[PDB]
């Protein structure tokens, strides 16, 4: 026997896992909640006990994917050997271009999320984690004397705007391999210009 | 009067009314009946000019983009900028002024990427503000004022930064200080870029 809180937690995770998989492959518009409930092996009644509607489930999917994106990026940044805050910023660019190239991340984060959530929803749900990490890297680069002292939150929001748009440019390009290479170069120059 | 004069006046009334109402309340909050009513057009005539709500939005974005391009060009010329690099610098101030218009933010920044999709909006902006940015970047490179690099990605990434800068100011608890701080970080980023 499982306790009710245990069954509720296992039900919730199965739905997030199933929605993430199916929406990742086919897009938010192409998969309904009945097919997701079936995929998770849960009844529709249990599903609607965890999530009021389709959009509430998508929001949780986005949160979980974004957390995964950050963890994957931290691994790539650690693998780059970056040993200063500025070098971590440079590596975070390449890490983002690699992870956002994941077809599931492309579908869920780049194509679906800005449309399903709107601007304010995407900032609050999707962007908040990356914005916080970016603010920290900026603060540390200023502390280390690698970046001129300046307002941290506006600069972080501007960088995130540039990085999100870079991923969109690659994701929609008729030659994504080429677009990724060109975009990587302009982003590296933009970061190097931002720094000392 | 002439038949095309009628359709053109009908088309222009629908775009003007849709621009105004969607500008004030957002695409999702105004239906085509309220727009036809604002424009003084019948439900049949409005349908004859625009197949669906999104088709009308596409023409609204075109004229708004045109207005943004013209306002940006006017302010940059008015700033006294006389080199491509100074024109790029002046565009920061010009955009922060033009983007203080809530209709511009609602239609271009909030609605357009949702209603048209990102690539669908790009197809419109490439003929207007995006194309203009690409040209200014090309000229700064030709002048040796900007490091040679892929023009199309740089133009689009810079616009992405400017889009979010405008939204950061608009939602700030203190918008007046946010505009000053955001101008500073944008100027520093551009000056480092040049």
Residue numbers in the entry:
A (entry chain A): 5 to 200
B (entry chain D): 6 to 199
What does the paper say about this structure?
Here, we show cytokinins induced the strong expression of the M. tuberculosis gene Rv0077c. We found that Rv0077c expression is repressed by a TetR-like transcriptional repressor, Rv0078. As previously reported, Rv0078 forms dimers resembling other TetR-like proteins. Rv0078 has an N-terminal DNA-binding domain (DBD) and a C-terminal ligand-binding domain (LBD).
To gain an understanding of how Rv0078 represses gene expression, we solved the crystal structure of Rv0078 to 1.85 Å by a single-wavelength anomalous dispersion method. The ligand-binding pocket of Rv0078 is largely hydrophobic. Within this pocket, we observed an elongated density resembling a long aliphatic chain of a fatty acid. Gas chromatography-mass spectrometry (GC-MS) of the compounds extracted from Rv0078 purified from Escherichia coli revealed fatty acids commonly found in this organism, and a palmitate molecule fit well with the electron density. A fatty acid carboxylate formed a hydrogen bond with Rv0078 Glu-70, and the long alkyl chain had numerous hydrophobic interactions within the extended ligand pocket. When we purified Rv0078 under denaturing conditions and refolded the protein to remove the lipid, we observed the same EMSA results as we observed with protein purified under native conditions (data not shown), suggesting this fatty acid is unlikely to be the native Rv0078 ligand; however, these data may suggest that the native ligand is fatty acid-like. Interestingly, we found that Trp100 faces the ligand-binding pocket, which suggests Trp100 interacts with the natural ligand. This hypothesis is supported by our data showing an Rv0078W100R mutant was unable to complement the Rv0078 deletion mutant strain (lane 8).
